[PDB]
Scaffold this active site. Structure first.
Site, PDB file in Angstrom:
ATOM      1  CG  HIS A 194      -1.435  -7.329  -3.549  1.00  0.00           C
ATOM      2  ND1 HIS A 194      -1.762  -7.599  -4.856  1.00  0.00           N
ATOM      3  CD2 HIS A 194      -1.378  -5.981  -3.449  1.00  0.00           C
ATOM      4  CE1 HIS A 194      -1.911  -6.467  -5.514  1.00  0.00           C
ATOM      5  NE2 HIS A 194      -1.676  -5.470  -4.686  1.00  0.00           N
ATOM      6  CD  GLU A 224      -0.887  -3.400  -9.385  1.00  0.00           C
ATOM      7  OE1 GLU A 224      -1.021  -4.316  -8.543  1.00  0.00           O
ATOM      8  OE2 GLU A 224       0.228  -3.049  -9.862  1.00  0.00           O
ATOM      9  CD  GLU A 267      -2.692   5.688   1.624  1.00  0.00           C
ATOM     10  OE1 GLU A 267      -2.622   6.485   2.585  1.00  0.00           O
ATOM     11  OE2 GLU A 267      -2.058   4.623   1.577  1.00  0.00           O
ATOM     12  CG  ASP A 313      -1.775 -10.894  -6.107  1.00  0.00           C
ATOM     13  OD1 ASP A 313      -2.299 -11.908  -6.621  1.00  0.00           O
ATOM     14  OD2 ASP A 313      -2.417  -9.979  -5.568  1.00  0.00           O
TER      15      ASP A 313
HETATM   16 CA    CA Z   1      -0.986   5.286   3.886  1.00  0.00          CA
END
Ligand code: CA
Ligand code: CA
Lengths: 335, 335
Positions: A269, A107, A116, A15
């Protein structure tokens, strides 16, 4: 054994939007990093911790709880930085650093920003390890929503009505069934769109300043806002797309660097998070759409993203749809 | 509710190679179908049973055990064939037809030909319902193997050695790790290749005539054969690809129709079945490769494909690798 999925890590680095935004965003902040110490929260393969060292940081603590931490240590050594960049396994909540740090880089953004994500971990590390006035890279995030007519979806739905012209068998009855299957669920769909698909001007509905008091409580309460827009023209409305950008301070350039996941910008991405209605709604130029969108933790699991959507199209009654990311969806940080 | 995955069915029909091969293969056999009766084993959305009626069959029994059988009935009615084409839910092993049939048509081929295929069901229906001398469409299948240098794999593995030139961080140490992850498993990988990837002349290693005595016992024993070939030139050998073709009799054209899944032929939804070595092996022009490949039922589950590979590259010792399709792999007939 191969516990981490190498293909996720190559997609990250492949990416070029993501990787170059971090490389350049870090470099923009040379004056603040020069001779200073950095904590990289969720260091992955280590590339961002090395960027920080290359931007002049004196010491970098690269914390990574996944299996890939081993590879990060080898990468650091291969680049001759084992003296300056220290790879530390395990969650940031219980690592011990020898000092507080001048900056945090991470990140942390998940799909839909907050599925998440590692934002909570970044906030905990800020509280525990970041010095007064320290630097956060990126420093803020913004959330966007737009109505969409997903041309790919349109093609898949209409495909059954096209079978007669290609093979001489009418299969247009399959379209209802296809609609129910592809749209009559409450799953957040991670998919990349283009500007072709955007049906009205995108609306910023939240802004998150990572350094600001109260952010972690806002996350638990729900990050969201109302929105209103007018459709560009005649199309089947399929639902809404949610995306984000994050911003790196500009340093002495005075030009912040924005990493966007908008479908009007180069693909990344992260793609976009798609919220489909149960079936298509025809709209026209200047059809009004308003509503409210909230990103929430799931009750079972605060890092499982839930999105509560309220919407009103034209003269129709306001409707509600409660979405969540599927158990079997794609992973980034928690593989 | 949506039990079947509509997206699998659209990929079937969007496979113009597959759909037109059946359409034309059925039509080639007009003289044998004219005024006759057909059993379609695993009728799916019904398109093949309708092709048969359009080719002049008097009555077609479309048997389908999945949820999609309902849509097939609606498709038949929409095309005005409810009189001639009867959709029958459930497995063919226990359906009752009012008569034996003149022909059987079936899209029975799985990934790797024999992963989760309906071949066994077709053979049972032949035994029980097909008249003496009846027609099978397709009538036969052939299995092929070739050594491959998967250029996409090569790119993914070497990508880590390329990071230095794009971002100024050497990540070439990640290549070993990537190799172990991407190749050091014994999973059959379903992926599409091109002729670029084929490293020596493909070798037919089995041929299956569906009407022939003993085929079902051969399936249980293992379908396989030895092979030998010479590499075209210098490349990293990544392993082997397995694919198949099936053949429809030519009827009065005297020209059989071959539906191929070769990477030298137009892509199809079956792709190819890839058998990777644990790591790449350098080869050169005229490097000899020989071995044996056997497609087997798994012990737990006869429709779970196992592939036993023995191979010898040049002067290296013969090696063995025992592959199987993963539990979590893609589905066609058993969703
Ligand atoms: Ca998951
Ligand atoms: Ca399966």
């Amino acid at each position: 054994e191969c516990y981490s999925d190498v293909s996720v890590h190559e997609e990250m680095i492949a990416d070029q939007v993501r990787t170059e935004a971090y490389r350049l965003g870090i470099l923009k902040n040379w004056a603040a990093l020069r001779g200073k110490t950095v904590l990289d929260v969720g260091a992955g393969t280590g590339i961002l911790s090395i960027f920080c060292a290359q931007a002049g940081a004196r010491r970098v603590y690269a914390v990574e709880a996944s299996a890939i931490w081993q590879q990060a240590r080898e990468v650091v050594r291969l680049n001759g930085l084992e003296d300056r960049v220290h790879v530390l396994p395990g969650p940031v909540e219980t690592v011990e650093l020898p000092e507080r740090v001048d900056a945090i880089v991470s990140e942390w953004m998940g799909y839909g920003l907050l599925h998440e994500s590692m934002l909570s971990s970044v906030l905990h590390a800020r509280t525990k390890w970041l010095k007064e006035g320290g630097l956060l890279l990126p420093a803020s995030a913004e959330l966007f929503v737009a109505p969409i007519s997903d041309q790919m979806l349109e093609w898949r739905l209409g495909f059954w009505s096209q079978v007669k012209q290609h093979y001489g068998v009418d299969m247009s009855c399959m379209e209802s069934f296809a609609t129910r299957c592809l749209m009559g669920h409450s799953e957040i769909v991670v998919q990349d769109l283009s500007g072709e698909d955007v049906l009205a001007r995108p609306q910023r509905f939240a802004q998150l300043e990572l350094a600001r008091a109260g952010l972690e409580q806002e996350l638990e309460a729900g990050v969201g806002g109302r929105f209103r827009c007018s459709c560009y023209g005649s199309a089947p409305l399929h639902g809404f797309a949610v995306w984000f950008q994050v911003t790196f301070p500009g340093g002495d350039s005075e030009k912040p660097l924005v990493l966007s996941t908008s479908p009007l910008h180069p693909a990344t991405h992260w793609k976009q998070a798609l919220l489909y209605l149960n079936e298509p709604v025809p709209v026209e130029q200047d059809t009004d759409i308003s509503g409210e969108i909230t990103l929430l933790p799931s009750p079972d699991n605060p890092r499982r993203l839930r999105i509560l959507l309220r919407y009103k199209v034209g003269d129709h009654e306001e409707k509600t749809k409660d979405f969540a990311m599927e158990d079997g969806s794609e992973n980034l940080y928690f593989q």
